[PDB]
Design a protein around this ligand. Structure first.
Ligand SMILES: CN1CC/C=C/[C@H](O)[C@@H]2CC[C@H]2CN2C[C@@]3(CCCc4cc(Cl)ccc43)COc3ccc(cc32)[C@@](O)(C(=O)O)CC1=O
Length: 155
């Protein structure tokens, strides 16, 4: 399942990088060029989402009250409720992953870094297993990179 594997790699790297503030220097697996570009795109667009919706992000984090492994496990149901049960577009996918990064940073701050990888898996499961048809129709991570591509300015 190449789409699942690629998705998990991109999402896991972004969440870990957000939490630690350090780039992972290990090579990507399969489809490395696209995955690198996808991660670069999340760095740009995801960071903006977290700031544009800072108050709402903080509010939801507070409401969720994430302390430990069991709370992190409980998030799948919430993601299905909020993300899966609605329209699908790249913006909503970016928000799913960006709020994930916001939770990952919280996990670092409460010294529960071990829960970041399970969190990344949960987000990937929700995205790929509930929206595969859409993702395939939209050309997967190549489509993601194409959708957010910015042309160079003249001059
Ligand atoms: C205009 N916006 C962005 C501002 C809305 C902020 C919301 O109050 C709340 C703060 C987090 C967001 C709720 N979640 C966050 C949520 C749902 C809460 C649990 C959760 C946990 C993780 Cl690890 C990742 C994501 C999520 C599901 O992902 C979302 C995707 C799309 C939208 C909202 C999502 C979103 O698409 C939606 O609200 O439907 C976001 C949207 O329209």
């Amino acid at each position: 399942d190449e789409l699942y594997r690629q998705s998990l790699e991109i999402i896991s790297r972004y969440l870990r990088e957000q939490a630690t503030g350090a780039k992972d220097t290990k090579p990507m697996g399969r489809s490395g060029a696209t995955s690198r570009k996808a991660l670069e795109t999340l760095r740009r667009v995801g960071d903006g989402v977290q700031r544009n919706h800072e108050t709402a992000f903080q509010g939801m984090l507070r409401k969720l009250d994430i302390k430990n492994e069991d709370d992190v496990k409980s998030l799948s149901r919430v993601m299905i409720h909020v993300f899966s049960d609605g329209v699908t577009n790249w913006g909503r996918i970016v928000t799913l992953i960006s709020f994930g990064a916001f939770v990952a940073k919280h996990l670092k701050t409460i010294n529960q870094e071990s829960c970041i990888e399970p969190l990344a898996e949960s987000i990937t499961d929700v995205l790929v297993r509930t929206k595969r048809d859409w993702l395939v129709k939209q050309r997967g991570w190549d489509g993601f990179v194409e959708f957010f591509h910015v042309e160079d300015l003249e001059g």
